[PDB]
Amino acid sequence: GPKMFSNFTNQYPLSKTLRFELKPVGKTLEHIEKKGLLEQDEKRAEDYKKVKKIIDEYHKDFIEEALNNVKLNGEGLEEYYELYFKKNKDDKDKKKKEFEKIQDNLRKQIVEAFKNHEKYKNLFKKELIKEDLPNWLKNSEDTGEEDKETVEKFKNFTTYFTGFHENRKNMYSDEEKSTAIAYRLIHENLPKFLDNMKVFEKIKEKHPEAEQLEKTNVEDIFSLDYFNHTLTQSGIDIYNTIIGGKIQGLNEYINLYRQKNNEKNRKLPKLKPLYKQILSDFENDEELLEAIEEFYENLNFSNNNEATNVLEKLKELLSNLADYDLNKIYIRNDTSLTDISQKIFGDWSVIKDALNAHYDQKWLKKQKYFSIAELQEALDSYCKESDESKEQKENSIADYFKTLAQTKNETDKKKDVEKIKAFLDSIMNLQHFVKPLHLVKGGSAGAEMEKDEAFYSEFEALYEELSQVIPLYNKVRNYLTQKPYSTEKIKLNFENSTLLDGWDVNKETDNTSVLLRKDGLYYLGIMNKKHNKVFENIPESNENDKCYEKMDYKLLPGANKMLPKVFFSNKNIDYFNPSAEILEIYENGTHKKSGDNFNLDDCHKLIDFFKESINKHEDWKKFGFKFSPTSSYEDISGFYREVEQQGYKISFKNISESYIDELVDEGKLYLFQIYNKDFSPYSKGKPNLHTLYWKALFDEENLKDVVYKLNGEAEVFYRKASINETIVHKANEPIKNKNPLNPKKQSTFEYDIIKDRRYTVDKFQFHVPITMNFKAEGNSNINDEVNEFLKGNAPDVNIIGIDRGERHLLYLTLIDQKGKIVEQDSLNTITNEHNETDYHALLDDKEKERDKARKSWGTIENIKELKEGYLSQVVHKIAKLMVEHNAIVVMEDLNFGFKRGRFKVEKQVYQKFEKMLIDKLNYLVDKDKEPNEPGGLLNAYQLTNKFESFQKMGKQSGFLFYVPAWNTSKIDPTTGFVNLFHPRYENVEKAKEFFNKFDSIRYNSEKDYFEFAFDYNNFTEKAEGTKWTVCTYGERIKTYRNADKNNQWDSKEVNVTEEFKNLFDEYNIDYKNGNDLKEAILSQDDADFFKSLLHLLRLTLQMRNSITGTEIDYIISPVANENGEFFDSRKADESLPKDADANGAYHIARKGLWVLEQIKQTDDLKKVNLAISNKEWLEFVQERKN
RNA sequence: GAAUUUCUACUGUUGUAGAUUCCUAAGGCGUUA
DNA sequence: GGGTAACGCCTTAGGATAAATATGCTAG
DNA sequence: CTAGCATATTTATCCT
Ligand SMILES: [Mg+2]
Ligand SMILES: [Mg+2]
Ligand SMILES: [Mg+2]
Ligand SMILES: [Mg+2]
Ligand SMILES: [Mg+2]
Ligand SMILES: [Mg+2]
């Protein structure tokens, strides 16, 4: 039943941001436009970006000025150096504790260097933008009045930089966070420095020197006590340019020195550069047409002042190549030779084989440019693999050149993209063809001897005119290829530095924002900053008139900060009058547990004082606080949690509609409507999930016991129109349906349907942060509870396995505790309550669509978005199956245990799918369940730990278990047979030794198949399982090769029994009587027979028989299971996988079953390990009795 | 040639079904012309 | 495969606040 | 000289 997840609700809190659209009401938009609140806020974005860049430059200079004067102790540096070189050993107390201690000491030294500088006192305050930044700009000579004006525009608006200052505070921190300077300089740069030191101390001390030592100080860069110099960005740059790789560097020297096999193999010791210091570093179609016409005129011209037409001049010059001497004409060694071989002979390797077999035999002295005469000589004798005895090549190179020059097509001479693209295609095809004869740069590995003047002198001047296409083609491909709509939105402030930062009643003349509600529609009023007291004094609240519902939001944000601040402030300390004992308790930190002076009595006394002060405070005693007895508090954390949980209430006050209308009309209030398509009068179906969250924020049931909290610091954005031309489906005209399974062929609408209507007009935005499970205990890691429940009670817990199939996008298999399969279904088609969608067909069609439209340069993209919008349906299906069938979910481990390629859902997409399922199961609601029923809106399931990173999650994420997908597809489902063989092919001796360890090779008189009896103990350094009996009945499909004709990736159904019979009979081997075949197979000789026998042996052991063209893909067993029956996926009994992709999901489910058995058996929970091993998995599948 | 806070599949009829945590900052890696 | 940055991913970090306090303006 | 008001800016710092 539902007992499994009934106790896994309300575990830890979550925070999410809901997005809406703001529709201005009445004269809101008119007044917004009149006061120019949109241009101002779009200019503020540019000003904010420029001032942030200026502050970044200021921080750059401060970092360069601070780290320059720091001097590390050095002895601690030597301690870190020796600890880093103490070998692997073990993670004992020393290797970890002293490592962390020295790292923290160095980091704190760097941070102390930061703090000592005078500029650090007011680096994150109003002083920075008021005085320090203008003074710093004035000091700089280059400066600029524009920069000073931009900074001065924020002289009374500094609070707008609070988030940026918080972002920039992370760099000057002690904690080991990636966004820090000390952390970088002690954890990332220094290990690279020591690695460079050790690779130098190895390679240089070896002394096989052939490079320049650069000695004829110098070596001080690599010695110790120099890490102080490379602390700044200038030092890092100096170290990198010394390393190098326009000044010669050590890395360049060593890379050039790795040749002649003296040190070439030792490429790993290559010097890695240090990491960079933190925070340190066409127009239109008319112009394109003009450039195209200019190049056309430059190409053809009008045949004036001699023939300047490059198209025919180059053709004539190439036709004249035969008359020119071939002893001085050079040819490129690049893929142009491959093209020449493919065109002249039809084989792309003839010329290269001639050059590597007849021209010379060492490393061939590889040169960039060969000579035409040498190629002619080589082609005159190329061993004539398969051709006429005498080949009429003549001047084969020149013959091919002139052939492609004129007789190839006789069509070289010639606004729409098609014509321009075809012309460009022909042009750079010709330029690629003529490129081999061009001399690249000068002094390219020698050669470049005295050239043919009469040919090459004209050729070099002719080719430069045609070489202008490459930059032209680059510009064309850069300009022509650039999405229909745009998602750039301007943030709106409404003249308030702190807007929407909080909803509290007291803090509403400062944030100038309220919520209103009427007839189930939620509005948002952002009052003008000039009149911010309009809501302070409501004239009346009579109920006869139609009334809005203004929200009375009250909150106590943080108890640990708010309580001492209010109760221990010079303004209020007299009112509350803390006793001397309480003041001493707070000062000495006795209440805190982190301090060594922890005292339960002091903490309880402070808690009692806080309770009394809260009772005294007028705005806080209205919260209706109800605390536990003070004697039950373990520490101050419990009291703070209680205050935070109970310090939040929402009430709705009634205000006249006429007052709001007058405020909107007069321009004092900007009234929007928080809108969603579920808020429309025509909406009738199930509302969106975020709409349910928003409406539950203010529900009476929710407000009785808060589950949803309205968080402050919201944002209002403005998105401009992005799509000018519209594709509109006119009204009263039938529209063809896009769903083939839909019975209704056409639909008629009495109104227009504009494509992407949300992007053709200006739309406001509203991002509302909300919190789920406000009063949650905080069990962020439910693994201990899930494991305890699974061990205690699991007679009815099923297992679900998800594997990305080769053909099927994703395959699902649900199994019991006994391994019996209940449900098998490929997730390629999702059958929801409506007609099913063939997502496999969609992706299959759209991949072809994208690859064919890429040449057309239509920026369709998609594919990714469809595959990332497909996985949402799969996540919904998985959640439904988990809730309905009481099953855990087991998946592939993509960190350690990932699979190969050639699956539809690649590793990158599968990681995102796993992340999406983890996120969904963090808070899992059903739009159909009751609000209070478990799994409903107010009692949501929480079946997964909060997601932080792919690496942080281990082998268990709550109810999701991760297993290595090693040996999950190519295993028999019935028995546990696995093909662990790695035969390969070698000489006769090793093959004969291999076949010598088979127990018994024989022919079965009955049923007409071979028996290959053996034991796994003879093969590989493993001792597991028992002796198997591999047969020759269940292996059909075989492929010849990977490419080319007469051998290809083409399936050929062949009976291995018949082929084995023919192979044995054709060398007079007798097997009719049924005798053991070990004799007469040791006859040796005829190695090809051994290759054939070994290929059949590999053939008779493959599990997955696949055909590329046809969809059939079946797994068929080579061994029987206690009844002389060989498994076959084709003739399955619905208790075994029906498909070659089903086997992976079934075996992942079985791995999860093994995980469940391990959890149940162990009595040492909260410490047990779940990472399965290959030996244990092999023993599990080969468990004899099931 | 298809409406959406936003995405995907739709017509499920001014919308249907299921995802949907947003803003800012820093760093690392990969394709290539 | 020799010392190129426009895109495309990944990692990490801060926040999702009311109230005390300092400062500018009116008034004197 | 100048008490009071209104606004902008900073601050208060649990424990797992
Ligand atoms: Mg303000
Ligand atoms: Mg709906
Ligand atoms: Mg798999
Ligand atoms: Mg498979
Ligand atoms: Mg929708
Ligand atoms: Mg769409």
Side-chain angles (χ1 to χ4, degrees), chain A residues 677-678 688:
Chain A
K677 78 170 139 177
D678 314 318
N688 295 127

PDB file of all heavy atoms in Angstrom, chain A residues 677-678 688, chain B residues 4 6-9 16-19, ligand 5:
ATOM      1  N   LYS A 677      -2.122  31.876 -17.762  1.00  0.00           N
ATOM      2  CA  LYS A 677      -3.223  31.403 -18.597  1.00  0.00           C
ATOM      3  C   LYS A 677      -4.256  30.625 -17.793  1.00  0.00           C
ATOM      4  O   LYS A 677      -5.371  30.409 -18.281  1.00  0.00           O
ATOM      5  CB  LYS A 677      -2.696  30.552 -19.754  1.00  0.00           C
ATOM      6  CG  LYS A 677      -2.315  29.133 -19.386  1.00  0.00           C
ATOM      7  CD  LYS A 677      -2.036  28.311 -20.635  1.00  0.00           C
ATOM      8  CE  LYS A 677      -0.837  27.403 -20.441  1.00  0.00           C
ATOM      9  NZ  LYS A 677      -0.604  26.546 -21.632  1.00  0.00           N
ATOM     10  N   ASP A 678      -3.915  30.202 -16.575  1.00  0.00           N
ATOM     11  CA  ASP A 678      -4.883  29.610 -15.662  1.00  0.00           C
ATOM     12  C   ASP A 678      -5.739  30.649 -14.953  1.00  0.00           C
ATOM     13  O   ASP A 678      -6.745  30.281 -14.338  1.00  0.00           O
ATOM     14  CB  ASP A 678      -4.166  28.752 -14.623  1.00  0.00           C
ATOM     15  CG  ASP A 678      -3.129  27.846 -15.241  1.00  0.00           C
ATOM     16  OD1 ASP A 678      -3.408  27.256 -16.305  1.00  0.00           O
ATOM     17  OD2 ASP A 678      -2.033  27.728 -14.662  1.00  0.00           O
ATOM     18  N   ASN A 688      -1.771  25.027 -13.971  1.00  0.00           N
ATOM     19  CA  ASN A 688      -0.351  24.732 -13.881  1.00  0.00           C
ATOM     20  C   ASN A 688       0.061  24.573 -12.423  1.00  0.00           C
ATOM     21  O   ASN A 688      -0.590  25.075 -11.504  1.00  0.00           O
ATOM     22  CB  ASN A 688       0.479  25.831 -14.541  1.00  0.00           C
ATOM     23  CG  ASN A 688       0.246  25.921 -16.030  1.00  0.00           C
ATOM     24  OD1 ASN A 688      -0.066  26.987 -16.557  1.00  0.00           O
ATOM     25  ND2 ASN A 688       0.400  24.800 -16.722  1.00  0.00           N
TER      26      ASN A 688
ATOM     27  P     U B   4       0.739  33.292 -26.420  1.00  0.00           P
ATOM     28  OP1   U B   4       0.193  34.582 -25.935  1.00  0.00           O
ATOM     29  OP2   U B   4       2.037  33.256 -27.134  1.00  0.00           O
ATOM     30  O5'   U B   4       0.850  32.311 -25.174  1.00  0.00           O
ATOM     31  C5'   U B   4      -0.122  32.334 -24.135  1.00  0.00           C
ATOM     32  C4'   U B   4       0.313  31.511 -22.947  1.00  0.00           C
ATOM     33  O4'   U B   4       0.435  30.118 -23.348  1.00  0.00           O
ATOM     34  C3'   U B   4       1.661  31.898 -22.347  1.00  0.00           C
ATOM     35  O3'   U B   4       1.630  31.666 -20.940  1.00  0.00           O
ATOM     36  C2'   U B   4       2.613  30.905 -23.004  1.00  0.00           C
ATOM     37  O2'   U B   4       3.809  30.676 -22.294  1.00  0.00           O
ATOM     38  C1'   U B   4       1.743  29.657 -23.071  1.00  0.00           C
ATOM     39  N1    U B   4       2.131  28.705 -24.120  1.00  0.00           N
ATOM     40  C2    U B   4       2.783  27.557 -23.726  1.00  0.00           C
ATOM     41  O2    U B   4       3.049  27.312 -22.564  1.00  0.00           O
ATOM     42  N3    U B   4       3.120  26.705 -24.745  1.00  0.00           N
ATOM     43  C4    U B   4       2.873  26.878 -26.087  1.00  0.00           C
ATOM     44  O4    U B   4       3.239  26.016 -26.883  1.00  0.00           O
ATOM     45  C5    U B   4       2.191  28.089 -26.414  1.00  0.00           C
ATOM     46  C6    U B   4       1.850  28.938 -25.443  1.00  0.00           C
ATOM     47  P     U B   6       5.931  33.757 -21.703  1.00  0.00           P
ATOM     48  OP1   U B   6       6.469  34.844 -22.553  1.00  0.00           O
ATOM     49  OP2   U B   6       4.618  33.161 -22.031  1.00  0.00           O
ATOM     50  O5'   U B   6       7.019  32.599 -21.663  1.00  0.00           O
ATOM     51  C5'   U B   6       8.387  32.895 -21.432  1.00  0.00           C
ATOM     52  C4'   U B   6       9.151  31.664 -21.018  1.00  0.00           C
ATOM     53  O4'   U B   6       8.653  31.185 -19.743  1.00  0.00           O
ATOM     54  C3'   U B   6       9.022  30.461 -21.937  1.00  0.00           C
ATOM     55  O3'   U B   6       9.863  30.536 -23.073  1.00  0.00           O
ATOM     56  C2'   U B   6       9.346  29.300 -21.007  1.00  0.00           C
ATOM     57  O2'   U B   6      10.747  29.193 -20.808  1.00  0.00           O
ATOM     58  C1'   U B   6       8.712  29.775 -19.701  1.00  0.00           C
ATOM     59  N1    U B   6       7.341  29.248 -19.519  1.00  0.00           N
ATOM     60  C2    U B   6       7.208  28.005 -18.943  1.00  0.00           C
ATOM     61  O2    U B   6       8.164  27.338 -18.589  1.00  0.00           O
ATOM     62  N3    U B   6       5.916  27.571 -18.794  1.00  0.00           N
ATOM     63  C4    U B   6       4.767  28.239 -19.155  1.00  0.00           C
ATOM     64  O4    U B   6       3.669  27.719 -18.959  1.00  0.00           O
ATOM     65  C5    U B   6       4.990  29.518 -19.744  1.00  0.00           C
ATOM     66  C6    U B   6       6.236  29.966 -19.902  1.00  0.00           C
ATOM     67  P     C B   7       9.433  29.811 -24.439  1.00  0.00           P
ATOM     68  OP1   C B   7      10.348  30.266 -25.512  1.00  0.00           O
ATOM     69  OP2   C B   7       7.968  29.974 -24.607  1.00  0.00           O
ATOM     70  O5'   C B   7       9.727  28.272 -24.162  1.00  0.00           O
ATOM     71  C5'   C B   7      11.046  27.818 -23.900  1.00  0.00           C
ATOM     72  C4'   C B   7      11.078  26.331 -23.647  1.00  0.00           C
ATOM     73  O4'   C B   7      10.476  26.034 -22.362  1.00  0.00           O
ATOM     74  C3'   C B   7      10.295  25.473 -24.624  1.00  0.00           C
ATOM     75  O3'   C B   7      10.994  25.234 -25.831  1.00  0.00           O
ATOM     76  C2'   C B   7      10.021  24.213 -23.815  1.00  0.00           C
ATOM     77  O2'   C B   7      11.170  23.379 -23.785  1.00  0.00           O
ATOM     78  C1'   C B   7       9.815  24.788 -22.416  1.00  0.00           C
ATOM     79  N1    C B   7       8.387  24.993 -22.083  1.00  0.00           N
ATOM     80  C2    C B   7       7.641  23.924 -21.578  1.00  0.00           C
ATOM     81  O2    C B   7       8.198  22.825 -21.439  1.00  0.00           O
ATOM     82  N3    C B   7       6.339  24.119 -21.258  1.00  0.00           N
ATOM     83  C4    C B   7       5.787  25.320 -21.427  1.00  0.00           C
ATOM     84  N4    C B   7       4.503  25.483 -21.105  1.00  0.00           N
ATOM     85  C5    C B   7       6.525  26.423 -21.933  1.00  0.00           C
ATOM     86  C6    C B   7       7.808  26.217 -22.242  1.00  0.00           C
ATOM     87  P     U B   8      10.183  24.954 -27.188  1.00  0.00           P
ATOM     88  OP1   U B   8      11.153  24.962 -28.309  1.00  0.00           O
ATOM     89  OP2   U B   8       9.014  25.866 -27.223  1.00  0.00           O
ATOM     90  O5'   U B   8       9.641  23.469 -27.008  1.00  0.00           O
ATOM     91  C5'   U B   8      10.540  22.384 -26.835  1.00  0.00           C
ATOM     92  C4'   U B   8       9.820  21.125 -26.425  1.00  0.00           C
ATOM     93  O4'   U B   8       9.234  21.289 -25.107  1.00  0.00           O
ATOM     94  C3'   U B   8       8.644  20.716 -27.293  1.00  0.00           C
ATOM     95  O3'   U B   8       9.027  20.085 -28.499  1.00  0.00           O
ATOM     96  C2'   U B   8       7.844  19.823 -26.355  1.00  0.00           C
ATOM     97  O2'   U B   8       8.444  18.541 -26.252  1.00  0.00           O
ATOM     98  C1'   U B   8       8.031  20.552 -25.024  1.00  0.00           C
ATOM     99  N1    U B   8       6.913  21.485 -24.756  1.00  0.00           N
ATOM    100  C2    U B   8       5.760  20.959 -24.211  1.00  0.00           C
ATOM    101  O2    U B   8       5.639  19.778 -23.935  1.00  0.00           O
ATOM    102  N3    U B   8       4.751  21.865 -23.994  1.00  0.00           N
ATOM    103  C4    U B   8       4.783  23.217 -24.269  1.00  0.00           C
ATOM    104  O4    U B   8       3.804  23.921 -24.024  1.00  0.00           O
ATOM    105  C5    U B   8       6.007  23.681 -24.836  1.00  0.00           C
ATOM    106  C6    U B   8       7.002  22.821 -25.055  1.00  0.00           C
ATOM    107  P     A B   9       8.172  20.331 -29.836  1.00  0.00           P
ATOM    108  OP1   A B   9       8.938  19.792 -30.987  1.00  0.00           O
ATOM    109  OP2   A B   9       7.742  21.750 -29.849  1.00  0.00           O
ATOM    110  O5'   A B   9       6.881  19.425 -29.632  1.00  0.00           O
ATOM    111  C5'   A B   9       6.999  18.018 -29.487  1.00  0.00           C
ATOM    112  C4'   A B   9       5.687  17.387 -29.095  1.00  0.00           C
ATOM    113  O4'   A B   9       5.352  17.752 -27.733  1.00  0.00           O
ATOM    114  C3'   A B   9       4.475  17.820 -29.900  1.00  0.00           C
ATOM    115  O3'   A B   9       4.368  17.145 -31.139  1.00  0.00           O
ATOM    116  C2'   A B   9       3.324  17.533 -28.947  1.00  0.00           C
ATOM    117  O2'   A B   9       3.012  16.148 -28.942  1.00  0.00           O
ATOM    118  C1'   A B   9       3.953  17.887 -27.602  1.00  0.00           C
ATOM    119  N9    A B   9       3.656  19.270 -27.191  1.00  0.00           N
ATOM    120  C8    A B   9       4.488  20.355 -27.265  1.00  0.00           C
ATOM    121  N7    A B   9       3.955  21.463 -26.817  1.00  0.00           N
ATOM    122  C5    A B   9       2.684  21.079 -26.420  1.00  0.00           C
ATOM    123  C6    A B   9       1.619  21.797 -25.857  1.00  0.00           C
ATOM    124  N6    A B   9       1.674  23.101 -25.591  1.00  0.00           N
ATOM    125  N1    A B   9       0.484  21.124 -25.575  1.00  0.00           N
ATOM    126  C2    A B   9       0.435  19.815 -25.845  1.00  0.00           C
ATOM    127  N3    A B   9       1.371  19.031 -26.374  1.00  0.00           N
ATOM    128  C4    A B   9       2.485  19.732 -26.642  1.00  0.00           C
ATOM    129  P     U B  16      -6.798  25.324 -20.375  1.00  0.00           P
ATOM    130  OP1   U B  16      -7.666  24.863 -19.265  1.00  0.00           O
ATOM    131  OP2   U B  16      -5.485  25.944 -20.076  1.00  0.00           O
ATOM    132  O5'   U B  16      -6.542  24.084 -21.339  1.00  0.00           O
ATOM    133  C5'   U B  16      -7.593  23.194 -21.684  1.00  0.00           C
ATOM    134  C4'   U B  16      -7.048  21.879 -22.178  1.00  0.00           C
ATOM    135  O4'   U B  16      -6.386  22.073 -23.453  1.00  0.00           O
ATOM    136  C3'   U B  16      -5.982  21.241 -21.303  1.00  0.00           C
ATOM    137  O3'   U B  16      -6.523  20.533 -20.203  1.00  0.00           O
ATOM    138  C2'   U B  16      -5.225  20.362 -22.286  1.00  0.00           C
ATOM    139  O2'   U B  16      -5.940  19.163 -22.535  1.00  0.00           O
ATOM    140  C1'   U B  16      -5.268  21.218 -23.551  1.00  0.00           C
ATOM    141  N1    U B  16      -4.052  22.049 -23.717  1.00  0.00           N
ATOM    142  C2    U B  16      -2.934  21.461 -24.270  1.00  0.00           C
ATOM    143  O2    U B  16      -2.904  20.295 -24.616  1.00  0.00           O
ATOM    144  N3    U B  16      -1.847  22.289 -24.402  1.00  0.00           N
ATOM    145  C4    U B  16      -1.769  23.619 -24.047  1.00  0.00           C
ATOM    146  O4    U B  16      -0.725  24.247 -24.222  1.00  0.00           O
ATOM    147  C5    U B  16      -2.967  24.151 -23.484  1.00  0.00           C
ATOM    148  C6    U B  16      -4.039  23.370 -23.346  1.00  0.00           C
ATOM    149  P     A B  17      -5.697  20.424 -18.832  1.00  0.00           P
ATOM    150  OP1   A B  17      -6.546  19.709 -17.849  1.00  0.00           O
ATOM    151  OP2   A B  17      -5.152  21.765 -18.504  1.00  0.00           O
ATOM    152  O5'   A B  17      -4.468  19.483 -19.197  1.00  0.00           O
ATOM    153  C5'   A B  17      -4.658  18.100 -19.447  1.00  0.00           C
ATOM    154  C4'   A B  17      -3.341  17.400 -19.659  1.00  0.00           C
ATOM    155  O4'   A B  17      -2.807  17.737 -20.965  1.00  0.00           O
ATOM    156  C3'   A B  17      -2.230  17.782 -18.698  1.00  0.00           C
ATOM    157  O3'   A B  17      -2.325  17.109 -17.457  1.00  0.00           O
ATOM    158  C2'   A B  17      -0.974  17.441 -19.487  1.00  0.00           C
ATOM    159  O2'   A B  17      -0.722  16.044 -19.448  1.00  0.00           O
ATOM    160  C1'   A B  17      -1.399  17.807 -20.906  1.00  0.00           C
ATOM    161  N9    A B  17      -0.983  19.167 -21.293  1.00  0.00           N
ATOM    162  C8    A B  17      -1.752  20.300 -21.271  1.00  0.00           C
ATOM    163  N7    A B  17      -1.131  21.372 -21.687  1.00  0.00           N
ATOM    164  C5    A B  17       0.135  20.911 -22.011  1.00  0.00           C
ATOM    165  C6    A B  17       1.269  21.566 -22.512  1.00  0.00           C
ATOM    166  N6    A B  17       1.299  22.871 -22.778  1.00  0.00           N
ATOM    167  N1    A B  17       2.378  20.832 -22.732  1.00  0.00           N
ATOM    168  C2    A B  17       2.336  19.522 -22.459  1.00  0.00           C
ATOM    169  N3    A B  17       1.328  18.794 -21.983  1.00  0.00           N
ATOM    170  C4    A B  17       0.241  19.556 -21.778  1.00  0.00           C
ATOM    171  P     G B  18      -1.740  17.786 -16.125  1.00  0.00           P
ATOM    172  OP1   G B  18      -2.252  17.019 -14.964  1.00  0.00           O
ATOM    173  OP2   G B  18      -1.969  19.248 -16.209  1.00  0.00           O
ATOM    174  O5'   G B  18      -0.174  17.528 -16.228  1.00  0.00           O
ATOM    175  C5'   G B  18       0.332  16.214 -16.393  1.00  0.00           C
ATOM    176  C4'   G B  18       1.779  16.227 -16.812  1.00  0.00           C
ATOM    177  O4'   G B  18       1.907  16.735 -18.165  1.00  0.00           O
ATOM    178  C3'   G B  18       2.693  17.123 -16.003  1.00  0.00           C
ATOM    179  O3'   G B  18       3.069  16.554 -14.763  1.00  0.00           O
ATOM    180  C2'   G B  18       3.856  17.350 -16.959  1.00  0.00           C
ATOM    181  O2'   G B  18       4.705  16.216 -16.997  1.00  0.00           O
ATOM    182  C1'   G B  18       3.122  17.446 -18.296  1.00  0.00           C
ATOM    183  N9    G B  18       2.816  18.843 -18.653  1.00  0.00           N
ATOM    184  C8    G B  18       1.616  19.483 -18.481  1.00  0.00           C
ATOM    185  N7    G B  18       1.632  20.721 -18.886  1.00  0.00           N
ATOM    186  C5    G B  18       2.923  20.909 -19.352  1.00  0.00           C
ATOM    187  C6    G B  18       3.527  22.058 -19.915  1.00  0.00           C
ATOM    188  O6    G B  18       3.017  23.166 -20.113  1.00  0.00           O
ATOM    189  N1    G B  18       4.855  21.828 -20.254  1.00  0.00           N
ATOM    190  C2    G B  18       5.520  20.639 -20.076  1.00  0.00           C
ATOM    191  N2    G B  18       6.802  20.597 -20.464  1.00  0.00           N
ATOM    192  N3    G B  18       4.961  19.559 -19.553  1.00  0.00           N
ATOM    193  C4    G B  18       3.671  19.763 -19.214  1.00  0.00           C
ATOM    194  P     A B  19       3.777  17.465 -13.648  1.00  0.00           P
ATOM    195  OP1   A B  19       3.711  16.755 -12.348  1.00  0.00           O
ATOM    196  OP2   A B  19       3.230  18.839 -13.760  1.00  0.00           O
ATOM    197  O5'   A B  19       5.294  17.504 -14.119  1.00  0.00           O
ATOM    198  C5'   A B  19       6.130  18.592 -13.769  1.00  0.00           C
ATOM    199  C4'   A B  19       7.302  18.706 -14.706  1.00  0.00           C
ATOM    200  O4'   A B  19       6.846  19.101 -16.024  1.00  0.00           O
ATOM    201  C3'   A B  19       8.323  19.767 -14.343  1.00  0.00           C
ATOM    202  O3'   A B  19       9.220  19.344 -13.335  1.00  0.00           O
ATOM    203  C2'   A B  19       8.992  20.056 -15.677  1.00  0.00           C
ATOM    204  O2'   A B  19       9.939  19.046 -15.992  1.00  0.00           O
ATOM    205  C1'   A B  19       7.814  19.926 -16.637  1.00  0.00           C
ATOM    206  N9    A B  19       7.211  21.230 -16.983  1.00  0.00           N
ATOM    207  C8    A B  19       7.851  22.270 -17.610  1.00  0.00           C
ATOM    208  N7    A B  19       7.102  23.323 -17.815  1.00  0.00           N
ATOM    209  C5    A B  19       5.877  22.956 -17.283  1.00  0.00           C
ATOM    210  C6    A B  19       4.658  23.644 -17.190  1.00  0.00           C
ATOM    211  N6    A B  19       4.472  24.883 -17.646  1.00  0.00           N
ATOM    212  N1    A B  19       3.623  23.006 -16.604  1.00  0.00           N
ATOM    213  C2    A B  19       3.812  21.763 -16.146  1.00  0.00           C
ATOM    214  N3    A B  19       4.910  21.015 -16.177  1.00  0.00           N
ATOM    215  C4    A B  19       5.926  21.674 -16.760  1.00  0.00           C
TER     216        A B  19
HETATM  217 MG    MG E   5       0.356  25.052 -20.339  1.00  0.00          MG
END
